[PDB]
Ligand binder design. Sequence first.
Ligand SMILES: CC#C[C@]1(O)CC[C@H]2[C@@H]3CCC4=CC(=O)CCC4=C3[C@@H](c3ccc(N(C)C)cc3)C[C@@]21C
Length: 250
Amino acid sequence: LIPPLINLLMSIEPDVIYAGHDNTKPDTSSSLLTSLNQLGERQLLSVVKWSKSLPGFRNLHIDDQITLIQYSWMSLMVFGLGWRSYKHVSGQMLYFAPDLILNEQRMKESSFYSLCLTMWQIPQEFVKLQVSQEEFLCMKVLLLLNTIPLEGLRSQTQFEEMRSSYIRELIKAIGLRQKGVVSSSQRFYQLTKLLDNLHDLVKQLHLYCLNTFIQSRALSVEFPEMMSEVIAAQLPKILAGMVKPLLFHK
Ligand SMILES: CC#C[C@]1(O)CC[C@H]2[C@@H]3CCC4=CC(=O)CCC4=C3[C@@H](c3ccc(N(C)C)cc3)C[C@@]21C
């Protein structure tokens, strides 16, 4: 049977979130980017709500909670994007939302095709590894807990304990299907290596995002309130490498 913490994690998953995109008009660079920003805002609010229900998180200092959300939102959103694409469209479209689905042809006409291909890697890897929902749910918590300040957190002890607890839960999630010590240990390496590899992909997304933000007036792209502050609050520092990415492997 499924371990209770994994069961809890499934129960607190956000519901389906819509972009509010107007699909009756043809795509433009500005319209797509704006819908993506609107969806991002909605997904951020959803991440905040999720975090409030996430066992352990509310007991970290409030400053730490804010920092970890500010550090991890891009990772959580692209990982989510990968999951939805894998589950709803067999990994073969980018499933941003039910009203914002980009098949490859739409990607090619997006104006940011290379960015789409970079993002599209994640669901193709989920297809390759056949990631289970239980593994996904645990890995997603670890992404929230995958970067800390250079000086550490205020609730560092509690953070280490919480992070270690979700790593132990990932190991149980793996043990649900992959039986055999060799397979299970290899599976842990592969899934944790995937999380390590996400740091680099996410850096490309952070740069694109920051450039788009700076040039938002010229490009006629709107950035909502919570998006503007999470970017204001940490993106340059993160891009500069003035934080500590946590790696599972050297
Ligand atoms: C085209 C394009 C583009 C981007 O600027 C770069 C990565 C995109 C990100 C991917 C991963 C991603 C997955 C989603 O499901 C929603 C949106 C999303 C984005 C976009 C985004 C926009 C604003 C925010 N805020 C308000 C915090 C969050 C995410 C658009 C992003 C950043």
